[PDB]
Structure 1
Amino acid sequence: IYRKEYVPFPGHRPDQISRWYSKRTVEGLPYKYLITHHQEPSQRYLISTYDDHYNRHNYHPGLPELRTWNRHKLLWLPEKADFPLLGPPTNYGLYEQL
């Protein structure tokens, strides 16, 4: 019965795929910004307060003088509502030097 059962098997290749897929079943490799990103996708959104208020001189495409008082919500928004985000971020010449 030993010589019965222990006939060799050429071609029972083990799989490599279910282990590799359970790895990302646990991990989830590109998933780690799909967990905490919010609102609308955006690559460059970020700028600082000294550079916006002082050196920048503030928002450009907005209303320069008009602050219009709206109907339903009781508010003078078109200055406050922008919260300026114009243009490129704070660049001042350090990537050049380094």
Structure 2
Amino acid sequence: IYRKEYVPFPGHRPDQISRWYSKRTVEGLPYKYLITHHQEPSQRYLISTYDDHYNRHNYHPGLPELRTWNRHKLLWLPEKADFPLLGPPTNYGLYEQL
């Protein structure tokens, strides 16, 4: 019985790839697919409030200088603290110094 049952099996390589899928499905989704909301860059919101309100003097070359009243939202819409120049990151030269 032993020499009939326990016969060598040629060309039987093991499964070494489904365990990769099982490890990767428990690693989890990266941070892009779980917490990043409006497909947003890693360069946008890096502006200090001091650096926006004193260093650049509320620059933002796209707001009207006089606010205007709307018919639907009953407020004078263009809020200079609500659209705070999501633009050039705050640099002062520490990168080149280091």
What is the TM-score with the length of structure 2 in the denominator? 0.79
Alpha-carbon distance, 1:38 to partner: 5.0
Report the RMSD for the aligned CA atoms in angstroms: 2.5
Contact 1:60 1:86 (8 Å CA) reproduced = no
Percent identical among aligned pairs is 100
Contact 1:59 1:86 (8 Å CA) reproduced = no
Alpha-carbon distance, 1:73 to partner: 1.4
Q: Distance in 1 between matches of 2:35 and 2:65?
A: 42
Contact 2:64 2:78 (8 Å CA) reproduced = no
CA deviations on 1:25-79 (whole Å, 9 max, x unpaired) are: 1112535653454565564222101100001111332334221000011101113
Query: Structure 1: which 5+ residue stretches go unaligned?
Result: none
Structure 1 counterpart SS, 2:62: coil
Query: Structure 2: which 5+ residue stretches go unaligned?
Result: none
Residues 31/79 of structure 1: CA separation in 2 closer, same or farther (3 Å cut): closer
More off after superposition, 5-14 vs 57-66: 57-66
User: In structure 2, what is the equivalent of residue 32 of structure 1?
Assistant: 32
What is the TM-score with the length of structure 1 in the denominator? 0.79
Q: Distance in 2 between matches of 1:63 and 1:32?
A: 31
Residues 62/32 of structure 1: CA separation in 2 closer, same or farther (3 Å cut): closer
Contact 2:68 2:77 (8 Å CA) reproduced = yes
Residues 14/6 of structure 1: CA separation in 2 closer, same or farther (3 Å cut): same
